[PDB]
Amino acid sequence: SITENTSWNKEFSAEAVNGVFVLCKSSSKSCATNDLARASKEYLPASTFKIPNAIIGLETGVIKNEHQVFKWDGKPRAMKQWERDLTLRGAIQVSAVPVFQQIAREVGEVRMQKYLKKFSYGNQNISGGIDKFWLEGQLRISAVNQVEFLESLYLNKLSASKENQLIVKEALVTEAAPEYLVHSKTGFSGVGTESNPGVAWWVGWVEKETEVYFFAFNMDIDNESKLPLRKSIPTKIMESEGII
Amino acid sequence: GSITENTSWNKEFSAEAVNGVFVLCKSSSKSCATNDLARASKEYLPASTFKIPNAIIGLETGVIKNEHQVFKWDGKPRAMKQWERDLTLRGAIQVSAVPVFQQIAREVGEVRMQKYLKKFSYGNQNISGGIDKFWLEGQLRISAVNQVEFLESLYLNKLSASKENQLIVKEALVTEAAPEYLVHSKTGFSGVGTESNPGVAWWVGWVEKETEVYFFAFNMDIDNESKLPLRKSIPTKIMESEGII
Numbered sequence: 001s002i003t004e005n006t007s008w009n010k011e012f013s014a015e016a017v018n019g020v021f022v023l024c025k026s027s028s029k030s031c032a033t034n035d036l037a038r039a040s041k042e043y044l045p046a047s048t049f050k051i052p053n054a055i056i057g058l059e060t061g062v063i064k065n066e067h068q069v070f071k072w073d074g075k076p077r078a079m080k081q082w083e084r085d086l087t088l089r090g091a092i093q094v095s096a097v098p099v100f101q102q103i104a105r106e107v108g109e110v111r112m113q114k115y116l117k118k119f120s121y122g123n124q125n126i127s128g129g130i131d132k133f134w135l136e137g138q139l140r141i142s143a144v145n146q147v148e149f150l151e152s153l154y155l156n157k158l159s160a161s162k163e164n165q166l167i168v169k170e171a172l173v174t175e176a177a178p179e180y181l182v183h184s185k186t187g188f189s190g191v192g193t194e195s196n197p198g199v200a201w202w203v204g205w206v207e208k209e210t211e212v213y214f215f216a217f218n219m220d221i222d223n224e225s226k227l228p229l230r231k232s233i234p235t236k237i238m239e240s241e242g243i244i
Numbered sequence: 245g246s247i248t249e250n251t252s253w254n255k256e257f258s259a260e261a262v263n264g265v266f267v268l269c270k271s272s273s274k275s276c277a278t279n280d281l282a283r284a285s286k287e288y289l290p291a292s293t294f295k296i297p298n299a300i301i302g303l304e305t306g307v308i309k310n311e312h313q314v315f316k317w318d319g320k321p322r323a324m325k326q327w328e329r330d331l332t333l334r335g336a337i338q339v340s341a342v343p344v345f346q347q348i349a350r351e352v353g354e355v356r357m358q359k360y361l362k363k364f365s366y367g368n369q370n371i372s373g374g375i376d377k378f379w380l381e382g383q384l385r386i387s388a389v390n391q392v393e394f395l396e397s398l399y400l401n402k403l404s405a406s407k408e409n410q411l412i413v414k415e416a417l418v419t420e421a422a423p424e425y426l427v428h429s430k431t432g433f434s435g436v437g438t439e440s441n442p443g444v445a446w447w448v449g450w451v452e453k454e455t456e457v458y459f460f461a462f463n464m465d466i467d468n469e470s471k472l473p474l475r476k477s478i479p480t481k482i483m484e485s486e487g488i489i
């Protein structure tokens with residue numbers, strides 16, 4: 001069940017941004033959004049895929065455990081922040097693509113396909129290269145599907161050990177306060193091409209008081225300078241809801 | 245493992261007219277540093293820092309259902325208005341909801357509680373003085389050094405408990421999160437104490453920065469609640485000058 005909320009498009013139009021925000025309280029059974037159509041529209045997950053990839057890496061033994069260190073071989077990487085040894089949380093937080101590309105290669109297509117089916121992850125299409133399907137491939141997932149996926153993770157209901165889900169959940173904490181904890185992951189596919197904008201994401205959940213809120217936000221983007229909006233718009237909306 | 249004294253840290257202590265100790269250990273080198281080797285080994289009431297092992301014991305014995313259990317408020321007034329509400333495990337640890345943990349301690353029982361503190365090698369392992377207050381006003385005592393050893397075991401999931409339960413308690417202890425580091429910690433406060441017998445204030449935890457991990461334990465004598473904030477500001481100042489957080 002998805003209900004549209006008009007008091008949210010104000011944050012979007014004010015920034016001339018085409019996007020959607022999905023917020024669900026207690027569970028993914030009842031969610032609110034600014035655009036019913038876009039809430040379920042599927043987009044390339046980009047780095048938000050690091051969440052299922054981390055779980056699958058742990059489940060398959062590819063990632064030995066939570067204390068696994070991902071050694072930098074000294075070879076140049078796309079971002080300087082990636083050129084260094086990294087822990088799992090570290091690789092997730094700085095969005096170290098090469099680390100996850102290697103995890104993907106070791107997981108292999110058969111196991112990758114198998115897990116995306118068990119996780120009901122978007123269109124489950126991993127074609128185009130085992131180390132880049134979530135970056136430039138055909139994999140697509142919606143904001144609503146993202147929330148359902150995160151809820152299962154929160155509840156330890158994904159097909160994986162609770163241990164491994166707990167490990168990934170801690171690696172996703174991005175904000176801690178006395179009253180609440182925020183688990184999230186950002187994503188950016190790029191600026192896209194003419195007539196075909198890229199997508200920017202921010203998904204996760206908020207554990208406030210004894211309640212829990214699952215959210216997923218994405219927007220069309222053709223200029224990296226607009227990136228900050230993937231967090232500001234959603235944060236503003238959740239602030240007006242007294243969630244954070 | 246090793247420990248070295250660095251009296252230069254006393255700087256932050258004098259500037260605030262505080263008598264206390266800070267123990268900071270680097271996991272990779274397994275070496276620790278402290279402003280005072282003597283106080284580092286002195287044992288004090290763990291106070292609310294005991295909620296860490298207590299929470300672990302609660303999950304292990306089944307007293308605590310799971311990470312999602314909600315501790316409902318019975319409505320009966322409590323020592324602090326902050327505790328008068330329904331709380332999650334994390335919520336109860338963050339606000340130090342004593343009543344919540346006294347209930348847990350009671351359900352656990354002396355025999356089992358004693359067993360786990362033995363397995364955990366927790367301080368003096370003395371729980372006499374009331375199963376529901378031995379860590380608040382009882383005879384239980386633990387040093388700053390023992391605290392970091394305990395926390396390292398928890399970090400490495402090496403405590404005599406399921407990894408799942410240690411993981412649950414570990415996320416409950418998250419107090420600060422940044423792209424470059426994650427801080428796990430728990431404060432402690434016994435009271436203002438008496439004449440020539442001040443209370444004790446604690447701040448223990450660990451920092452996961454880059455691929456290094458820093459375990460810390462801090463305590464100080466306290467006679468006035470106004471100085472309470474010092475339990476965090478002093479250690480924070482030290483770890484900042486060390487470029488840790």
Ligand SMILES: [Ca+2]
Nearest residue numbers: 169181207415
């Ligand atoms: Ca959590």
Ligand SMILES: [Ca+2]
Nearest residue numbers: 095186187188
């Ligand atoms: Ca990004």
Ligand SMILES: [Ca+2]
Nearest residue numbers: 170414426452
């Ligand atoms: Ca941690």
